[PDB]
Design an enzyme around this catalytic site. Sequence first.
Site, PDB file in Angstrom:
ATOM      1  N   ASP A  38       0.956  -1.502  -0.084  1.00 38.82           N
ATOM      2  CA  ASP A  38      -0.184   0.612  -0.206  1.00 38.82           C
ATOM      3  C   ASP A  38       0.897   1.642   0.292  1.00 38.82           C
ATOM      4  O   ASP A  38       1.746   1.729   1.527  1.00 38.82           O
ATOM      5  CB  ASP A  38      -1.134   0.360   0.951  1.00 38.82           C
ATOM      6  N   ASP A  70      -1.417   5.741  -4.976  1.00 38.70           N
ATOM      7  CA  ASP A  70      -1.957   4.885  -4.260  1.00 38.70           C
ATOM      8  C   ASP A  70      -2.435   3.696  -4.282  1.00 38.70           C
ATOM      9  O   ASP A  70      -3.680   3.062  -5.007  1.00 38.70           O
ATOM     10  CB  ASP A  70      -3.601   5.790  -3.088  1.00 38.70           C
TER      11      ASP A  70
HETATM   12  C1  LIG Z   1     -14.145   4.188  -3.831  1.00 38.33           C
HETATM   13  O1  LIG Z   1     -13.125   4.181  -3.560  1.00 38.33           O
HETATM   14  C2  LIG Z   1     -13.439   3.536  -2.045  1.00 38.33           C
HETATM   15  C3  LIG Z   1     -11.904   2.245  -2.072  1.00 38.33           C
HETATM   16  C4  LIG Z   1     -11.781   1.192  -2.768  1.00 38.33           C
HETATM   17  C5  LIG Z   1     -10.086   0.584  -2.382  1.00 38.33           C
HETATM   18  C6  LIG Z   1      -9.257   0.468  -1.210  1.00 38.33           C
HETATM   19  C7  LIG Z   1     -10.118   1.748  -0.931  1.00 38.33           C
HETATM   20  C8  LIG Z   1     -10.806   3.124  -0.470  1.00 38.33           C
HETATM   21  C9  LIG Z   1      -9.165   1.883   0.680  1.00 38.33           C
HETATM   22  O2  LIG Z   1      -9.295   3.003   1.457  1.00 38.33           O
HETATM   23  N1  LIG Z   1      -7.764   1.865   0.877  1.00 38.33           N
HETATM   24  C10 LIG Z   1      -6.623   2.228   2.150  1.00 38.33           C
HETATM   25  C11 LIG Z   1      -5.362   3.067   1.002  1.00 38.33           C
HETATM   26  O3  LIG Z   1      -4.948   3.040   2.115  1.00 38.33           O
HETATM   27  C12 LIG Z   1      -6.297   5.190   0.983  1.00 38.33           C
HETATM   28  N2  LIG Z   1      -4.633   5.214   0.394  1.00 38.33           N
HETATM   29  C13 LIG Z   1      -5.319   7.342   1.088  1.00 38.33           C
HETATM   30  C14 LIG Z   1      -5.533   7.529   2.708  1.00 38.33           C
HETATM   31  C15 LIG Z   1      -7.454   7.791   2.462  1.00 38.33           C
HETATM   32  C16 LIG Z   1      -8.098   8.285   3.487  1.00 38.33           C
HETATM   33  C17 LIG Z   1      -6.672   7.457   4.579  1.00 38.33           C
HETATM   34  C18 LIG Z   1      -4.968   7.681   4.682  1.00 38.33           C
HETATM   35  C19 LIG Z   1      -4.407   7.581   5.731  1.00 38.33           C
HETATM   36  C20 LIG Z   1      -4.110   5.495   6.854  1.00 38.33           C
HETATM   37  C21 LIG Z   1      -3.150   7.528   5.471  1.00 38.33           C
HETATM   38  C22 LIG Z   1      -4.662   6.907   3.657  1.00 38.33           C
HETATM   39  C23 LIG Z   1      -6.439   1.408   2.024  1.00 38.33           C
HETATM   40  C24 LIG Z   1      -7.499  -0.305   1.898  1.00 38.33           C
HETATM   41  C25 LIG Z   1      -8.262   0.014   3.180  1.00 38.33           C
HETATM   42  C26 LIG Z   1      -6.493  -1.986   1.800  1.00 38.33           C
HETATM   43  C27 LIG Z   1      -6.963  -2.808   2.268  1.00 38.33           C
HETATM   44  O4  LIG Z   1      -8.345  -2.883   1.026  1.00 38.33           O
HETATM   45  C28 LIG Z   1      -7.313  -3.428   0.236  1.00 38.33           C
HETATM   46  C29 LIG Z   1      -9.063  -3.861  -0.937  1.00 38.33           C
HETATM   47  C30 LIG Z   1      -9.848  -2.785  -1.331  1.00 38.33           C
HETATM   48  C31 LIG Z   1      -9.354  -1.662  -2.365  1.00 38.33           C
HETATM   49  N3  LIG Z   1      -9.826  -0.331  -3.229  1.00 38.33           N
END
Ligand SMILES: COCc1cc2cc(c1)C(=O)N[C@H]([C@H](O)CNCc1cccc(C(C)C)c1)C[C@H](C)CCOCCCCN2
EC number: 3.4.23.46
Length: 377
Positions: free
Chosen positions: A35, A220
Amino acid sequence: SFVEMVDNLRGKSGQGYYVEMTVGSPPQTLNILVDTGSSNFAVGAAPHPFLHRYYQRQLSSTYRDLRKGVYVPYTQGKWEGELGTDLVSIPHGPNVTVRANIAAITESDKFFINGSNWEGILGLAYAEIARPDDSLEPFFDSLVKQTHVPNLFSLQLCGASVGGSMIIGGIDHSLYTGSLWYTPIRREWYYEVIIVRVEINGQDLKMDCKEYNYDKSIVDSGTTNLRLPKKVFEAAVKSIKAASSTEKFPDGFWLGEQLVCWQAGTTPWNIFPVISLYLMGEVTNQSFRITILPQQYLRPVEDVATSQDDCYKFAISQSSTGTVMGAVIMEGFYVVFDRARKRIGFAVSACHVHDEFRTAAVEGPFVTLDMEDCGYN
Ligand SMILES: COCc1cc2cc(c1)C(=O)N[C@H]([C@H](O)CNCc1cccc(C(C)C)c1)C[C@H](C)CCOCCCCN2
């Protein structure tokens, strides 16, 4: 010695890419999602219906308790747990062992996915966005501090289940063709970049380029879709609708909910436009572009029905936290996270996306005036 790391990633479509790691003494084997959108290293450490296995601290003679809690809220999903350190290795990686911070996950909500085959997460971004705060050293910073591994890594994510490569410590020249083009890392928190122009089928969206980066743009690998700020998303959907008006779709398809199908082998690719994102370059007034095919933003999904067609979901969706260049953008490119030189590189991947009359590309140089104005403050 990079050949040992080629093809070390696996995944399921829409569920991320993972690498094999071990933690503890004696080594416990776990699959860890890669990630670039976060900065915490965390693993399942308690039973869960969707976990095949988990980290057992009681069985590691090298485990150390940090006597502090931790929680991480993502866009979608969250977990809480307990902090500690232990020894970590990557079997299909460099031949080293590091003592790393580990968040042992005890409770979670919509984080683990039914039957995904991974059990933890490796956040590869910078300390500034780590929880509970920036004093928890991220894994890759520990790796660089404790070994001779150079301060860069590269990701080749291959599309649709799926596979790829994470080259730790360098660039493997057999994984891409053509030239690498670099964009500055604007600030070391997320992997933040600046988009300076957008074109769809060769036509400029003609917006204030600040709109493209409101309030940030990040690379990302942990998010599936291309996610666009509201105003940019609306302009892009209107343009993709017009280019494809030959056919008609439910409006829930454009919201990412409903899938669409066609008779196997008859997907009308030619009626979906190409998208070009121009990124800030390395010299004054210079940019470069990457071009995205519909085979990237129409993500194929299994048909839940008795028919055996080709079915897809629209993989561009709306954001209120800036642009997210997700996995469908990264697929088919070789992406170099050159932390030592504060830059991110793009080239056409060896596992690139095929169309019949069109091709994904990374092309430059272009001249773009006032690129500094495109960053949001
Ligand atoms: C339509 O979209 C919705 C959506 C779809 C997806 C992921 C995310 C959101 C998601 O949430 N993926 C975050 C990334 O880490 C996010 N990266 C940026 C970010 C955003 C908010 C907070 C933070 C902090 C913690 C630094 C970081 C990591 C995931 C939990 C990892 C587990 O999921 C993987 C499969 C799903 C992939 N599909």
